[PDB]
Amino acid sequence: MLREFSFYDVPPAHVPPVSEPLEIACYSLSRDRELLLDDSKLSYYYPPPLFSDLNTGFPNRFHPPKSDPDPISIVKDVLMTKGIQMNSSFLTWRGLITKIMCAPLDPRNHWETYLVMDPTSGIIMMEERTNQDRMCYWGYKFEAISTLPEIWDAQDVVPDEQYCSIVKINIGKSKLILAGEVDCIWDKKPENPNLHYVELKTSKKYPLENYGMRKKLLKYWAQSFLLGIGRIIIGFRDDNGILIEMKELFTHQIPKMLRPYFKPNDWTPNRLLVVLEHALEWIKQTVKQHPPSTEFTLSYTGGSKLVLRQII
Ligand SMILES: Cc1cc2nc3c(=O)[nH]c(=O)nc-3n(C[C@H](O)[C@H](O)[C@H](O)COP(=O)(O)OP(=O)(O)OC[C@H]3O[C@@H](n4cnc5c(N)ncnc54)[C@H](O)[C@@H]3OP(=O)(O)O)c2cc1C
Ligand SMILES: [Mg+2]
Ligand SMILES: [Mg+2]
Structure with missing residues (x-):
């Protein structure tokens, strides 16, 4: 028995309201993976030297990432440890909402998540249960050379x-608690901090006329939008992996910058939000329609549809 949600069954609607994402907790992960309830791992942005070689250190200085999905219970336990009560509809990693939201853009990227409603709180928890080539290293390396740890008070x-920042964000009728990684901060951490946060990306530069470039920027926007990140800073690199150009963007500016380039068919920021809000309402309706602790998978395998399955 399957339940299906159609991207294209969603009527043209007004863009749903989205609240300013409010940080309710944060934490750091040491190199040794120790979870610390502090800001010791929040770094400051500082522009690296132009023509920096992003190959430097690959592979002998490269400690590849863990490469296992993290259970969302980590975040529930962080909130429990700080005595913060979960009164929302969804609890998950930011990147798993990005995957739902951007699925219309990315028929190639197939994914599956696991959902369960928590019996005490009633929130719907979502996680994966199921990245170190030279290309990804350039990304990690650009983050490394573009940041400065806390030193004075270290x-x-x-x-x-x-x-990691944990925010409350409301998308239409869905209240979400989202945890996401923050690359660094523009200045002193305050007032809600997220507009001060910075996302760092590395990319080849293409014109905005280029459909792939637009799709990439839309995914950049979606990711940072969901965590209230104020800035996205792109290190443009050449095919050799040399840093050529720094581009500082305000997240809210990306939908504006792309407006003159969208074709009549294209997925737009507002269309993506409309569909996402319908998908979330559908997931919620389907799940709540069962007793808590019932396990579901939410799958996307191409095409135009999400599929929710009850696990037995
Ligand atoms: C099989 C599998 C392996 C995973 N391995 C990791 C891992 O080694 N480290 C990790 O932080 N998360 C890993 N994840 C994802 C985590 O479970 C979790 O969803 C995520 O860490 C939550 O953090 P978000 O900020 O919401 O992640 P996102 O919005 O999805 O991405 C933010 C940043 O997390 C990093 N990241 C995200 N996914 C991966 C990945 N699959 N491998 C390596 N780095 C990743 C990367 O630097 C990325 O920056 P960028 O987008 O510029 O490339 C893995 C997931 C699966 C299914
Ligand atoms: Mg990182
Ligand atoms: Mg990044």
């Missing part, structure tokens, strides 16, 4: 070391 490329 090289190898260790993507396992991370800072």
Whole structure:
């Protein structure tokens, strides 16, 4: 027995309201994976030298990332440890909402998540249960050379070391608690901090007329939008992996920058939000229609549809 949700069955609607994502907790992960309830792993952004060689250190200074999905119970336990109550509809990693939201854009990227409603809180928890080639290293390396740790109050490329923000964000009728990795911060951490946060990306530069470039930027936007990240800073590199150009974007500016280039068919920020809000309402309706602790999988395998299965 399958339940299916059609991207294209969603009528043209007004873009749903989305609240300013509010940080309710944060934590750091040491290089050794120790989970610390502090900001010791929040780094500051500082522009690296132009023509930096992103190959430097690959592979002998590269500690490849863990490469196993993290259970979302980590985040539930963080909130429990700090005595924060979960009064929302969804609890998951930011990147798993990005996957739902951007699925219309990415027929090639197939994924599967696991959902269970928590019996005490009633929130729907979602996780994966199921990245270190030279291309990804350039990404990790750009993050490394573009950041500065806290020093006053306190090289190898260790993507396992991370800072994480946990936000409350409302998308239409769905209240979500989302945990996501924050690459660094623009200035002193305050007022809600997320607009101060920065996402770092590395990419070849293509014109905005290029459909692939637009799709990539839309995914950049979606990711940072879901965590309230104020800035996305792109290190443009050439085919040799040399840093050529720094581009500082404000997240809210990406939908504006792309407006003159969308073709009449294209997926737009507003269309993506409309569909996402319908998908979330559908997931919620389907799950709540059962007793808590019932396990489901949410799958996308190409085409136009999400499929929710009850696990037995
Ligand atoms: C089989 C499998 C292996 C995974 N291995 C890792 C891992 O080694 N480290 C990790 O942080 N998360 C890994 N994940 C994903 C985590 O379970 C979790 O969803 C995620 O870490 C939550 O953090 P978000 O900030 O919401 O992740 P996202 O919004 O999805 O991505 C943010 C950043 O997390 C990093 N990241 C995300 N996914 C992976 C991945 N699959 N492998 C390596 N780095 C990744 C990467 O630097 C990425 O930056 P960028 O987008 O610029 O490339 C894995 C998932 C699966 C299914
Ligand atoms: Mg990182
Ligand atoms: Mg990044």
